[PDB]
Amino acid sequence: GAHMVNMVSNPGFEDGLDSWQDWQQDMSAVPEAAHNGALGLKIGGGKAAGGGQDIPLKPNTTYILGAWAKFDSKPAGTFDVVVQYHLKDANNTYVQHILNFNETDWTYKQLLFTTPDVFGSTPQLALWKGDTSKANLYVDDVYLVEV
Ligand SMILES: OC[C@H]1O[C@@H](O[C@H]2[C@H](O)[C@@H](O)[C@H](O[C@H]3[C@H](O)[C@@H](O)[C@H](O[C@H]4[C@H](O)[C@@H](O)[C@H](O[C@H]5[C@H](O)[C@@H](O)[C@H](O)O[C@@H]5CO)O[C@@H]4CO)O[C@@H]3CO)O[C@@H]2CO)[C@H](O)[C@@H](O)[C@@H]1O
Ligand SMILES: [Ca+2]
């Protein structure tokens, strides 16, 4: 109203891996992983792996983080979607806003948070598949919207 601002670049992986860092060389944008559109992100099983992007959030602002994910077989651990940054306080507090997934059917989760007055480091959006079973992880439509 009149627009909703989304802060995630290439949120649906429709531009492949554009804008996303592939930390463990274990990511591909493939039709297999799509929940919407032509592509989704597949993070390959067998080792902990993930990727992410840096996001310039505004201070004192309400954001909604949301994502769709599923594992293609039962995981031991989880796949986590995280917004993280440091505060500029005495303890340099590291803040993490976390969605945890372990489902084998496509599942949507979301959370709301409000950013501080000042950031101690540039916010990062992390897609972290910490599970080490053979399960592949699909994730799609990762949104971070200002309201
Ligand atoms: O690989 C080369 C590449 O590395 C980049 O650095 C990456 C690195 O590769 C990743 O391994 C690393 O992954 C970390 C995630 O970013 C971060 O979100 C995650 O944080 C954990 C946290 O440690 C943990 O305490 C927390 O537990 C919560 C549970 O999830 C909840 O269920 C429960 O209720 O509460 C607890 C406590 O809050 O979970 C979160 C989410 O999993 O830790 C990951 C590592 O274990 O990210 C690095 C980037 O930040 C590097 O930048 C590149 O330059 C390089 O090329
Ligand atoms: Ca998609």
Domain boundaries, the chain: 1-147
User: Who's near 34: CB < 8 A, 6+ residues apart?
Assistant: 13, 40, 138, 140
d(CA 77, CA 131): 4
Burial of 95 (0-12, 13-18, 19+ CB in 10 A): middle
Spatial contact of 52 and 16, defined as CB atoms under 8 Å apart = no
**Protein residue with least CA distance to atom 54, ligand 1:** 23
Å from CA of 130 to ligand 1 middle: 8
* Range 94-99, long-range pairs (CB < 8 A, 24+ positions): 97/65, 99/65, 99/66, 99/67
Residue 71 sits at the vertex; the CA angle it makes with 127 and 94, to the nearest 5 degrees, is: 25
Å from CA of 128 to ligand 1 middle: 6
Strand partners, 98: 82
Residue 103 sits at the vertex; the CA angle it makes with 98 and 105, to the nearest 5 degrees, is: 130
Token look-up 């297999």 returns: 32
Report the SS3 class of residue 31.
helix
d(CA 125, CA 113): 14
User: Residues with Cβ within 6 A of ligand 1?
Assistant: 23-24, 50, 80, 82, 84, 96, 98, 100, 124, 126, 128, 130
CA 112 to chain centre: 14
d(CA 15, CA 19): 9
Resolution in A: 1.2
Spatial contact of 28 and 133, defined as CB atoms under 8 Å apart = no
Tokens of residue 68, six digits? 């769709």
d(CA 86, CA 66): 21
Å from CA of 11 to ligand 2 middle: 8
Token look-up 């599970």 returns: 131
**Protein residue with least CA distance to atom 44, ligand 1:** 128
Provide the CATH number for the domain formed by 1-147 in this structure. Answer: 2.60.120.260
